[PDB]
Amino acid sequence: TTTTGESADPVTTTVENYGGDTQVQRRHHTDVGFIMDRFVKINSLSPTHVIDLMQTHKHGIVGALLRAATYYFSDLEIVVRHDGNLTWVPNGAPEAALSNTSNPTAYNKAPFTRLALPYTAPHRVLATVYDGTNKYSTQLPASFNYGAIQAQAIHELLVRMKRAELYCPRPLLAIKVTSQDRYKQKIIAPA
Amino acid sequence: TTTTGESADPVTTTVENYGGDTQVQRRHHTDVGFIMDRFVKINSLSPTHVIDLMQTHKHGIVGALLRAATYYFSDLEIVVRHDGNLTWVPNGAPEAALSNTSNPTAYNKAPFTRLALPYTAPHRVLATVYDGTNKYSTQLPASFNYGAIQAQAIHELLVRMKRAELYCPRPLLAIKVTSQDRYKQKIIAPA
Amino acid sequence: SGNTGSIINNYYMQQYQNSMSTQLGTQNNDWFSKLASSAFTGLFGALLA
Amino acid sequence: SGNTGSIINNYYMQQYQNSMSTQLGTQNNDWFSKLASSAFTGLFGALLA
Amino acid sequence: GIFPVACADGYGGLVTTDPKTADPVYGKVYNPPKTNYPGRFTNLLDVAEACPTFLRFDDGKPYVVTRADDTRLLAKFDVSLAAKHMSNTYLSGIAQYYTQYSGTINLHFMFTGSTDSKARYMVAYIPPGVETPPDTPEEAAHCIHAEWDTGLNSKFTFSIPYVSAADYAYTASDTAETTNVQGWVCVYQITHGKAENDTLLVSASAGKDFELRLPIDPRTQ
Amino acid sequence: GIFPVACADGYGGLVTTDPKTADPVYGKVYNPPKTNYPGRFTNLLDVAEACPTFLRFDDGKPYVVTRADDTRLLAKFDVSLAAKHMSNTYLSGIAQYYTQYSGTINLHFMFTGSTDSKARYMVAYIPPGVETPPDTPEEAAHCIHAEWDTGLNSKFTFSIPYVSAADYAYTASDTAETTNVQGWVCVYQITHGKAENDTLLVSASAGKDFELRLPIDPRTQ
Amino acid sequence: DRLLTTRNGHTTSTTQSSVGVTYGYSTEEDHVAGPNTSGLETRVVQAERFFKKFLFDWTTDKPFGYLTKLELPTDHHGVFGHLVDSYAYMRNGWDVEVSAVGNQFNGGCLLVAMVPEWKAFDTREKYQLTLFPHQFISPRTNMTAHITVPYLGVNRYDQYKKHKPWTLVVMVLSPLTVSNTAAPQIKVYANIAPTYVHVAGELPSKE
Numbered sequence A, B: 001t002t003t004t005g006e007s008a009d010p011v012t013t014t015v016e017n018y019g020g021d022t023q024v025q026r027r028h029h030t031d032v033g034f035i036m037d038r039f040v041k042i043n044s045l046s047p048t049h050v051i052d053l054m055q056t057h058k059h060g061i062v063g064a065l066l067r068a069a070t071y072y073f074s075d076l077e078i079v080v081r082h083d084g085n086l087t088w089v090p091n092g093a094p095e096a097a098l099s100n101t102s103n104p105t106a107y108n109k110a111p112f113t114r115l116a117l118p119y120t121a122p123h124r125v126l127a128t129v130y131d132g133t134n135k136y137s138t139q140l141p142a143s144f145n146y147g148a149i150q151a152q153a154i155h156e157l158l159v160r161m162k163r164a165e166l167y168c169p170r171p172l173l174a175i176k177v178t179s180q181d182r183y184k185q186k187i188i189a190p191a
Numbered sequence C, D: 001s002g003n004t005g006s007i008i009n010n011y012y013m014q015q016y017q018n019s020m021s022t023q024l025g026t027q028n029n030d031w032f033s034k035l036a037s038s039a040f041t042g043l044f045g046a047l048l049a
Numbered sequence E, F: 001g002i003f004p005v006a007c008a009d010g011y012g013g014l015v016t017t018d019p020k021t022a023d024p025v026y027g028k029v030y031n032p033p034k035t036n037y038p039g040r041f042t043n044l045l046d047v048a049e050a051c052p053t054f055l056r057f058d059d060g061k062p063y064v065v066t067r068a069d070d071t072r073l074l075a076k077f078d079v080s081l082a083a084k085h086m087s088n089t090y091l092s093g094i095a096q097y098y099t100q101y102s103g104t105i106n107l108h109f110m111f112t113g114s115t116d117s118k119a120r121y122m123v124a125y126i127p128p129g130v131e132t133p134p135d136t137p138e139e140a141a142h143c144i145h146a147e148w149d150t151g152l153n154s155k156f157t158f159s160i161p162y163v164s165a166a167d168y169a170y171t172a173s174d175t176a177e178t179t180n181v182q183g184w185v186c187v188y189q190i191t192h193g194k195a196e197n198d199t200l201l202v203s204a205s206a207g208k209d210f211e212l213r214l215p216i217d218p219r220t221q
Numbered sequence G: 001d002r003l004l005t006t007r008n009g010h011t012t013s014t015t016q017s018s019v020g021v022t023y024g025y026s027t028e029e030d031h032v033a034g035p036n037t038s039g040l041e042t043r044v045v046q047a048e049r050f051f052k053k054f055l056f057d058w059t060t061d062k063p064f065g066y067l068t069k070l071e072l073p074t075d076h077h078g079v080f081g082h083l084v085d086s087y088a089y090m091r092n093g094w095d096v097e098v099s100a101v102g103n104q105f106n107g108g109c110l111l112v113a114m115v116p117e118w119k120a121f122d123t124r125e126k127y128q129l130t131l132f133p134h135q136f137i138s139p140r141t142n143m144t145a146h147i148t149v150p151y152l153g154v155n156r157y158d159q160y161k162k163h164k165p166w167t168l169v170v171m172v173l174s175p176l177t178v179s180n181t182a183a184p185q186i187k188v189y190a191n192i193a194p195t196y197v198h199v200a201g202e203l204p205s206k207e
Ligand SMILES: O=C(O)[C@@H]1O[C@@H](O[C@H]2[C@H](O)[C@@H](NS(=O)(=O)O)[C@@H](O)O[C@@H]2COS(=O)(=O)O)[C@H](OS(=O)(=O)O)[C@@H](O)[C@@H]1O[C@H]1O[C@H](COS(=O)(=O)O)[C@@H](O)[C@H](O)[C@H]1NS(=O)(=O)O
Pocket: B176, B177, B178, B179, E056, E057, E058, E059, E060, E087, E088
């Protein structure tokens, strides 16, 4: 098929053009809500930690995919391996509140704590990139977070996006290829 | 709107006065029963402890709110971290009864004991302040309590108000402001 | 209720789970709700819009 | 949903398990699905098969 | 056989705000009746709407005094639940326990002068976007404002509207904030006739759509 | 008595992709409305179909240049989501997170020359089974191919068919692979008239039956 | 004939080499009367007209990847500019027309796109810029590109002095080619019009 390409109108040809038969597709694994729904780890940690999905690694399946969207929304689940008790506080809270027990506080139970937390930002949607001239009264507004946690020590933090919604796609890149033809690597095979 | 203010009749204007649109409100978080329904800690403890909600801290969310009411009523839940077995006894009992096992006694089970206890005072409602010339045959009648607990050692005590009812509101104060304009503090923000 | 979010009905009977209220006569004895709803919202006097 | 495969209904109420969405007006506001389905599939011009 | 069960890791711990209930141990207790006990309140915002409390001005007074000189700005304050002027209100007392708010806040002005004291006032909401609030009624006129005079009715009520970028605003203020994020309110005195040393009491209450969400326990303990 | 239960060994552990949900601790939060927010996408393949992105040729250009000499092969590349030429496409960006694929991949050719520049091209799918791809239109004619010329419509689209032994093919390529398992695509220039230095942009998009299965997290972290 | 005449207020623009209009992310605006402005917002139709801006000179030496950007809103000296200094909050979409007139004997191709929340793109990311609302300009086919986009962002209303949601980008996809019969270079211009302009929060005067 030939078309006026300058218009940018989508064109999808099929093998029928030269005698083939287009087949059946099952696209469950490329479903946004499904694919974002798995735990991902946050590497940097500290006794006091503000939950920010952008601390996710840029090349991990979740972090790559999240960054391939401009705006997003989701609820959250967290797994925290910590010493002592864990206190969570919602978006907008004074850092000092983290010391108070009446905020959701999970008492230590081995081996870690799994929790379901609601979206809690004052915005209708959040962004992975924000073109602010400043945004004050490569930096993101401080209001873009899912609250904060505190314990005597935070050893590990996994985070899971629930009911994820993604808007306005952005570039997603594969590994840079050096070889003359294909990027080759060791694929699993029996001994 | 102008009115006769000396009458003290409530007046609630809206933005419609100058062309605005009043919006929709969802007030679940300011619901009394909901807000008082969370664990709060009691700092002073001892092997023998008489449960008194006024031992709650005056600036904590529960203690501040409770003190912002004259009379109240509620059932209770307690979490106790203790050595040995825990015995509870209802309001009006001889302190000596605490040593007897036939009163509700929870055998030690790690990491602590959670219990549901009923209101047990001889009054229809309790008070946070009591204007007694004396009240005998800044002090509250001894009958204002939820019973008492005893163990070999009591390390921690959390208390939770269930089915709370609050009557006749009293002053509730924010932090005293020193600054020329606003009380500013460190609000959580991502790193 | 307030801050209880379990779907399943309680394993223990109500007379054990809570103290039982008695009456002499939970109704609409909400003074402050009445007070707030009674607030004047109009505009005293004539208007020129 | 997406990546939840439990048969049994949740023990906790929805207003606890998740944040609650509000509206002003989940519908078919799927721009990219529309865009993709609108793609031209034919053949511009005359055919000789 | 018996029913197999998987005891799941990461579940089971006590969370101080959990939605479950404890197991009972002492049953069958009937309470003294408290049918129709007076003064009950079920939502903090009902009392916050019905009972306005006072703002704090100058050296600790619930009022503003009419200026004898040619300066017309009587007061200026941050539209913030954490503002110094709101620090003694019941509204700010409740607000400190929540992370976000939205909606209308109402201001009440009650003139206290003698029958032979007269005045004309103006209140304006200065939204954010300007560096400093105007100290002149003429400059503030371009904002949302209301003017009223003295007479038989001693009180005047005005609604500070919620106008912001996000749907909710923080109740607390961050240390990195120079200018108040939600703007200011300016009270002016257009003129007066023999009203020197006469007072204007100002109080605040929650409006019909005022809303507080996300409970928090922030005070030092 | 109470209900007997067997706490089973080997069950209960946290699996990062498990199909369960955590227990909640902070209820009753209502979100700001986001009704009808623009640009939403629910499946990665909808955008992969609607938005073709560019292939990479020679020294890093999204196009191929018409040859002035007597060599007619403009480009040759592996039908592989891991091919150097596909390395900057959105299609390969998504594909790296899946182990297998199947279906149609579409190529788009947009001529960029002036009105007085004309040419005739040919694209062929060389299936596996031959040692090296043909550098001649005459040899490649025996394969599935399409020829088109220049004119009013600047773009031409061709479907690379999925023809393989197994029902699915790997998205990644093993180090032990000499020849590309799925064959090659060869773009030729039959002739041209005054088209020296004129360009042919080439991009790719997912076809109607393109499919990706088996999610994977392979990048070094 | 591919004639299109666009009208915005008392200003009109017509091309005879139109390749159509590209709508990005949506065909309409979301709700302009949300809870964040109470009911105080108003539409100001007088700001809905075309203003102009020079972009760059498309020359033979500018290679693939060369890119010029224009963050919106930009400096404006008409009613729209006044609106920005007079109101605390605003929202509007954009109706964008970009012209690169040379002649039919030139070659090459420009990619014109509208990007939400701009970030400086890698040269590798430049291969996927078509993921954003766009259109192309190739001398053999057209001289005008036209894109229409709605207002968007984490906030229903904005403070343009602190944030710019949209940014127009024109990138060289294939270098300009010239001959004896062609135009030696092509100047690229933008004809922009803000759409559905709404303001809220009257600001005080400077006096
Ligand atoms: O230092 C102050 O802020 C002074 O405090 C106010 O008194 C408080 C009192 O401190 C408080 N007791 S507590 O132990 O702190 O809890 C309680 O009794 O309330 C009163 C009233 O406080 S209120 O918030 O103002 O309502 C003084 O008021 S009063 O004593 O007349 O009742 C208040 O006037 C004082 O503030 C002045 O001093 C401030 C700092 O002091 S210093 O410069 O270090 O010496 C200064 O910042 C204030 O501007 C000034 N008030 S002014 O408006 O008259 O200038």
